[PDB]
Amino acid sequence: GIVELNRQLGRGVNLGNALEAPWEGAWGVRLEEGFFELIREAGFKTIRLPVSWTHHAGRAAPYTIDPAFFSRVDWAVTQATRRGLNIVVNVHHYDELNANPQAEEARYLSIWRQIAERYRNQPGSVYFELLNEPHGRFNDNPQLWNDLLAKALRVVRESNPSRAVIVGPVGWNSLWRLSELRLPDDPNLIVTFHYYDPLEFTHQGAEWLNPVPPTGVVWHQQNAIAQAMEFAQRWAEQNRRPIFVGEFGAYEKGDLDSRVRWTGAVRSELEKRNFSWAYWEFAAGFGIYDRTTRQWRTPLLKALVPEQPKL
Ligand SMILES: N[C@@H](Cc1c[nH]c2ccccc12)C(=O)O
Ligand code: MET
């Protein structure tokens, strides 16, 4: 069942700065077929595929997704699956929906119907993820997200009765907001959160934030990671849901040794708690792979996939 589907997610990586930008390449990463084999060879079982459908769908009903863009997603799904990787297909950035859930609902539900119907026959290694990091008006009223996610799950289930569906809390998938998350009585849900604490370290110099946190911040482990993951595990036990931590990572403007400390500490605690996970991200400013030199960033990769269990 769903506990085994979550265990099968295992270790994963996001293909970020790619299809979740305004278009593929705008944020620096075009997808390549060779990425799938590299990710497998590095020890990952899963691709998370952020996709920002809003830039590629009609604004007026029936909100049709551009066929050429859809075919690109088809290709990613098919190539990952054929090469033995799981793939998580989400709806990723969606400024309109976070700002105005009620107004944008119709278009978002049409997008999910299109995705669900198109991929209804994909195997169980293909997972759906309803909405990356709900924020905006969902932060003001978390019940708006509880209501909307139930509508979207109902849409998905019309064509995909048993597929694993990944659902997170508001606060940009903050684990503390699990407290307000409410889920339908559906036995094939995996709960997700993202982990970037402390933001002053993991997002130092991140220009896409306002305010932009200053750089020069170092990091070492205290108790915050253990405290956060224990909270999340108790929530998951009480509510009988498996956990997938779909993003964690530290931006390259922090010093490498601090980033390695943080990445290894997080990965270790996730696996101690039996959480599957996907690192943010493959090839860009948080990347473990440098496409310019075609080399892995060894210290970061080994913090994710250690050669010995206590390293
Ligand atoms: N320097 C690497 C990784 C990288 C750093 N910042 C990025 C921003 C976007 C894309 C890639 C990157 C590259 O150019 O590929
Ligand atoms: C805030 S930068 C890391 C990526 C971002 N959290 C996303 O979900 O795309």
Residue numbers in the entry: 17 to 327
Extract from the study:
Here, by solving the crystal structure, it is shown that MtGlu5 from Meiothermus taiwanensis WR-220, a GH5-family endo-β-1,4-glucanase (EC 3.2.1.4), has a bipartite architecture consisting of a Cel5A-like catalytic domain with a (β/α)8 TIM-barrel fold and an inserted CBM29-like noncatalytic domain with a β-jelly-roll fold. MtGlu5 contains a Cel5A-like CD similar to TmCel5A from Thermotoga maritima, but has an additional novel domain inserted into an internal site in the CD. Unlike other known cellulases with CBMs at the termini, this inserted CBM in the newly identified MtGlu5 acts in synergy with the CD, as demonstrated by ITC experiments.
To investigate the origin of the disparity in catalytic efficiency between ΔCBM and MtGlu5, we crystallized ΔCBM and solved the structure by molecular replacement using the CD of MtGlu5 as a search model. The orthorhombic P212121 crystal contained one molecule of ΔCBM in its asymmetric unit. The apo-form structure of ΔCBM displayed an intact TIM-barrel fold. The crystal structure of ΔCBM presents almost the same polypeptide conformation as observed in the CD of MtGlu5, with an r.m.s.d. of 0.28 Å for 260 pairs of Cα atoms. In MtGlu5 (and also in TmCel5A) the β6–α6 loop is 30 residues long and contains the substrate-binding Trp224 (Trp210). Direct elimination of the CBM from MtGlu5 resulted in a shorter connection between this loop and the α6 helix, the equivalent of which in TmCel5A has one additional turn. Although the overall fold remained intact, the lack of flexibility in the tightened-up loop would probably have reduced the catalytic efficiency of ΔCBM. Similar results were obtained using the soluble substrate CMC. The kinetic data indicated that without the CBM domain, the K m of ΔCBM increased nearly ninefold and the k cat decreased by more than tenfold. The lower enzymatic activity of ΔCBM is not due to structural damage to the catalytic center, the integrity of which was demonstrated by analyzing the hydrolyzed products using mass spectroscopy.
